[PDB]
């Protein structure tokens, strides 16, 4: 729930940050956002130009809606586009227009059964058709300002759609203000906990949402905002940090290296573990992790055994190998992993004291409590100042269990088992020559 | 310093562009950017709406600051966030507010010792609390315009923060104008050369900077702008361009290929060489290269030997191999590498003359002086029109030194040594059968 803990494993040159809580996007909720349109001195010329801006944007969006919707072809906006193709049917936009008369928001059930939360964020019909057309003529300038303020959002929404080919992510305050999004969260069919979670992190909700331009028909401008559904909440999460583990023979080039490849975020999900290899897809609010299951791999509960016994036969833990013993560092949640090899100078420093630690050759770990920076040669690393408990788990480096002569130097996506039987066959290669003579 | 030179190596189907100068981001400098806030007819309704926009943005930012700061978890904004957590302490914002009374900028030493350059880019307190509140009432419209102009920056800064989850890069003119950034550069503790370098390339400084939303407390809106520190200046840089090198046996499929994998930018850094495999991370101002050391690999000075003797035993030069002899081209700083294999048509053309060169099978190189485009089958390549000297270094293609029968076809991240001993074992595999009979 809080109380971030972190364990570094001397044996595998890796660390695990535990104590986080999950918020996993497992589904999508489509909502329909609508703008109603009016079909139609220096005071008047300002109105002339501003009305030209209004209608130019409408025709611009009308050109954009011509059988457009698609992005990335990851089929992420597939759920939203499905609603869009339905909105293109005879009286479906009219249902939305009917419910939103003299209101800002409404629930509509399309003839497919899909209930959509609908919102009217701007009324240019009831402005142009009731205050602006009623007057080439004369006017007072503070109507020019008022028309510019209202028309601005339509122009800015057309701005985003044109440059993003009708689909935008993340969702801007132009597409949906905090007020409008918080209202939408309040009424979409989710747990009181899910509503609380989304409302406290609307910025993250924007990151994992889409705005899809749909249709301009019957004087309604409608676009679909595809909101995330977090169906997995409050389950344990943990992040795995990995760094190369090499031998430290004195002579340069005579060393063999090994690195765990399964780094990223892991979260419990219904008896299995969801793994997100691309830390891009996860957002962290200092004890809560929001991740998209689209880029997730569903793994057994036994994958955690790679943190306690990397040689267990129940799971085939993945590593890569090399014989390049370069010096590098990784910044974890509560500290830093420092892989110092060869002649390189590696240090940890406090901004007020200077160097308070010099690392020896090998893989080591320091916490962030009294350290500000870490230097590995020509690179300067800054540590996070998150608060937690840091643990060091003693153990023999597993790179010492391998014979350098039979060790597979180049393996990019191997594993403990695959490396072993690769070694077995190379041991058999020498062996059948060991009894001929 | 200038005078870009470029050498193409016939032996390894690669080229090196020398003569560039370095500007390497090795550290960060955190500065604090502040906005002071006021705590609180058709003329008045415009003020009403514009004041609603003002306070809605404040509450929007207040919702965003709730234990937020993090992005990417590369720990890039770690230094800036460390200042942010300090600004959350009892009288630390008050120190910033005290120094910035009746001024635009000031140096503040926080109680941690960290001296921060502080700037006040907008004063909405001394506007709302002195000209706007002094008047529901009456007014003259040119106060409506004036309030809209001042409030715009606050609204636009809230615009960026909401869609980027409180951390934005690159840094916009909304976060920090050229005037404000140039002033900040002038006073941050760097060499006169570093100040000159940053001030002539503020656009690049923006590319390698972060703006972090921090806190709204005690009527101050503060965000941290994390400016780059270029601790390595004016050292030689060079870019390596690589293209496949294949044999040219007549029969399709009977050929073996080879490609150097170490392409990217290289720069001298304190007795070693900094390598940036992701040319994304480097920005080039036609003889000056700005690179971030976060994505850098620190390599020995001997790595350059791969450009003069790819078979040297001092460095294990990296290659990948294949038996697919497809035709492809690479556009270098001063020309183009053309790998033409099989039946494909490869040409270089001048926009006024047409085809002035037809390439034969193999790897070749042409300069950009009198060539405008290069065609390799169905692809059209345009060459840069940078000026320099282009050199062709004769040499036997190293792919001809390999026997196709023992040649490892699929190696993705191999090296000269790893390929050799892979060949040795496969030669031993045939050999022990060569003396049984």
């Amino acid at each position: 729930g809080q109380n971030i803990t972190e364990e570094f494993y001397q044996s595998t040159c890796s660390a695990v940050s535990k104590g986080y809580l999950s918020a996993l996007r497992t589904g999508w909720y489509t909502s329909v956002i609508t703008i109603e349109l009016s079909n139609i001195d220096a005071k008047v010329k300002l109105i002339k130009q501003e009305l030209d801006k209004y209608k130019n944007a409408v025709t611009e969006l009308q050109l954009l809606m011509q059988s457009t919707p698609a992005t990335g072809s990851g089929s992420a906006i597939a759920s939203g586009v499905a609603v869009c193709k339905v909105l293109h049917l005879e009286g479906e936009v009219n249902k939305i227009k009917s419910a939103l008369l003299s209101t800002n928001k409404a629930v509509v059930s399309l003839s497919n059964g899909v209930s959509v939360l609908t919102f009217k964020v701007l009324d240019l019909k009831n402005y142009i058709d009731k205050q602006l057309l009623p007057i080439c003529s004369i006017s007072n300038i503070e109507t020019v300002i008022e028309f510019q303020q209202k028309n601005n959002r339509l122009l800015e929404i057309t701005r985003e759609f044109s440059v993003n080919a009708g689909v935008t992510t993340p969702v801007s305050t132009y597409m949906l203000t905090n007020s409008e999004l918080l209202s939408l969260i309040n009424d979409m069919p989710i747990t009181n906990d899910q509503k609380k979670l989304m409302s406290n992190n609307v910025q993250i909700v924007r990151q994992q949402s889409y705005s899809i331009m749909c249709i301009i028909k019957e004087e309604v401008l409608a676009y679909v905002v595809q909101l995330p559904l977090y169906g997995v909440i409050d389950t344990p999460c943990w992040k795995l940090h990995t760094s190369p583990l090499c031998t430290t023979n004195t002579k340069e080039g005579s060393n063999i290296c090994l690195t765990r490849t399964d780094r990223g975020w892991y979260c419990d999900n219904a008896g299995s573990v969801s793994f997100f290899p691309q830390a891009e897809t996860c957002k962290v609010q200092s004890n809560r992790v929001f991740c998209d299951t689209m880029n997730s791999l569903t793994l057994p509960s036994e994958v955690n055994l790679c943190n306690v016994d990397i040689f267990n036969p129940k799971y085939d833990c993945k590593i890569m190998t090399s014989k390049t013993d370069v010096s590098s560092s990784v910044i974890t949640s509560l500290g830093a992993i420092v892989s110092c090899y060869g002649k390189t100078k590696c240090t940890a420093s406090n901004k007020n004291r200077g160097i308070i630690k010099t690392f020896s050759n090998g893989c080591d770990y320091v916490s962030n409590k009294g350290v500000d920076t870490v230097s590995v040669g020509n690179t300067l690393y800054y540590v996070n100042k998150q608060e937690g408990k840091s643990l060091y788990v003693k153990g023999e480096p597993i790179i010492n269990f391998y014979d350098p002569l039979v060790f597979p130097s180049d393996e990019f996506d191997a594993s403990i088992s695959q490396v072993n039987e690769k070694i077995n066959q190379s041991l058999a290669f020498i062996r059948k020559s060991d009894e001929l003579l | 310093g200038q005078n870009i030179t470029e050498e193409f190596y016939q032996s390894t189907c690669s080229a090196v562009s020398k003569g560039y100068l370095s500007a390497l981001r090795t550290g960060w400098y955190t500065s604090v950017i502040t906005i002071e806030l006021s705590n609180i007819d058709a003329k008045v309704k415009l003020i009403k709406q514009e004041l609603d926009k003002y306070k809605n943005a404040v509450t929007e930012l207040q919702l965003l600051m709730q234990s937020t700061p993090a992005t990417g978890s590369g720990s890039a904004i770690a230094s800036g966030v460390a200042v942010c957590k300090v600004l959350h302490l009892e009288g630390e914002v008050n120190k910033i507010k005290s120094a910035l009374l009746s001024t635009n900028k000031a140096v503040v030493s926080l109680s941690n010792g960290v001296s921060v350059l502080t700037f006040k880019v907008l004063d909405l307190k001394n506007y709302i609390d002195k000209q706007l509140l002094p008047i529901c009432s009456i007014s003259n419209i040119e106060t409506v315009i004036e309030f809209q102009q001042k409030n715009n920056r606050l609204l636009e800064i809230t615009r960026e923060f909401s869609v980027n989850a409180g951390v934005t890069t690159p840094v916009s003119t909304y976060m920090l104008t050229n005037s404000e950034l140039l002033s900040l550069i002038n006073d941050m503790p760097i060499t006169n050369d570093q100040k000159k370098l940053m001030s002539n390339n503020v656009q690049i400084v923006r590319q390698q900077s972060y703006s972090i939303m921090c806190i709204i407390k005690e009527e101050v809106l503060a965000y941290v702008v994390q400016l780059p520190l270029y601790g390595v200046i004016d050292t030689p840089c060079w870019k390596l361009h690589t293209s496949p090198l294949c044999t040219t046996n007549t029969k399709e499929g009977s050929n073996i290929c080879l490609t150097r994998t170490d392409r990217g930018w290289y720069c001298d850094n304190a007795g070693s060489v900094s390598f940036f495999p992701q040319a994304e991370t480097c920005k080039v101002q036609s003889n000056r290269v700005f690179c971030d050391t976060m994505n850098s690999l620190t390599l020995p000075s001997e790595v350059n030997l791969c450009n003069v003797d790819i078979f040297n035993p001092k460095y294990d030069c990296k290659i990948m191999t294949s038996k697919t002899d497809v035709s492809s081209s690479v556009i270098t700083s001063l020309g183009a590498i053309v790998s033409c294999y099989g039946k494909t048509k490869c040409t270089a053309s001048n926009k006024n003359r047409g085809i002035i060169k037809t390439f034969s099978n193999g790897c070749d190189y042409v300069s950009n002086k009198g060539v405008d485009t290069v065609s390799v089958g169905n692809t059209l390549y345009y060459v840069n029109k940078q000026e320099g000297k282009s050199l062709y270094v004769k040499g036997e293609p190293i792919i001809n030194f390999y026997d196709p029968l023992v040649f490892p076809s699929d190696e993705f991240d191999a090296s000269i040594s790893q390929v050799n001993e892979k060949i040795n074992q496969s030669l031993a595999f045939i050999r022990k059968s060569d003396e049984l009979l």
Partner: antibody, heavy 132, light 110 residues
Framework: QVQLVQSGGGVVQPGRSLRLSCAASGFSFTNYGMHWVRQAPGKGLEWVAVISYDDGSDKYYADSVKGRFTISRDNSKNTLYLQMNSLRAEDTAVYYC?????????????????????????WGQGTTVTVS | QAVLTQPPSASGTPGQRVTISCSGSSLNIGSNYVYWYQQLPGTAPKFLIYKNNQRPSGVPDRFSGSKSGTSASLAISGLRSEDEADYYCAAWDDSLSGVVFGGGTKLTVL
């Protein structure tokens, strides 16, 4: 039964040397840093030295004793030492042995990779040293 | 000369709150955590406050701590007779490389 028991008290000659001992019982001594703290007659507390956890890599002294005093630990004997050299009249004080929590605030100790000051939770009852 | 400055004496009647101040520099208190100790007469110091505001197990609620910029203070609410003791603040100092103590505060209970 967390317990620190000190021994080694007595009078000495200026310019001579003298050692102190505090034997830990009731907890895993290896996993915690340890402090030496004195209190001169009628004066306040003065921090003397600290030893890092398990291996003592990091070991810091005050300038009042720098270059003359030395700290060391025997994890097998669960016992802490203070090497006092070149004793002077100003060193005359009651000497205390203290465990540094090293993370254990009621849960478990941590391993930061360097010395960090978590406080001073378990104290010996003190021993008396007089230089005359 | 007691790198951390705190008042020499304090006095109080039962039920009162006494407040003991402790002022340092950017290099000791402004940068690091502050810890408080209580030393009854003839006894060893007792661990009282850690990380500027945390009670160790078995320390009553009426003791509270706080830190402000470069200075810290300890609030002994509901003053009781046995609270009569010397109170010391302490923190890690980065200008040196060791722990620094306050001057002590002889607190008398009436």
């Amino acid at each position: 039964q967390v317990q620190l028991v000190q021994s080694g008290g007595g009078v000495v000659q200026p310019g001579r040397s003298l050692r102190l001992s505090c034997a830990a019982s009731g907890f895993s001594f290896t996993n915690y840093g340890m402090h030496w703290v004195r209190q001169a007659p009628g004066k306040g507390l003065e921090w003397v030295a600290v030893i890092s956890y398990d291996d003592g890599s990091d070991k810091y002294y005050a300038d009042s004793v720098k270059g003359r005093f030395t700290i060391s630990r025997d994890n097998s004997k669960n016992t802490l030492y203070l090497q006092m050299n070149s004793l002077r009249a100003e060193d005359t004080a009651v000497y205390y042995c203290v465990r540094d929590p090293t993370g254990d605030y009621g849960d478990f100790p941590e391993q930061d990779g360097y010395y960090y000051y978590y406080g001073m939770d378990v104290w010996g009852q003190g021993t008396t040293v007089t230089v005359s | 000369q007691a790198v951390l400055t705190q008042p020499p004496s304090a006095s109080g009647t039962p039920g009162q709150r006494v407040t003991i101040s402790c002022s340092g520099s950017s290099l000791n208190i402004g940068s690091n955590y502050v810890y408080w100790y209580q030393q009854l007469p003839g006894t060893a110091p007792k661990f009282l406050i850690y990380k500027n505001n945390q009670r160790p197990s078995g320390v009553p609620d009426r003791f509270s701590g706080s830190k402000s910029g470069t200075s810290a203070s300890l609030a002994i609410s509901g003053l009781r007779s046995e609270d009569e003791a010397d109170y010391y603040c302490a923190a890690w100092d980065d200008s040196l490389s060791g722990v620094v103590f306050g001057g002590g505060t002889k607190l008398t209970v009436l």
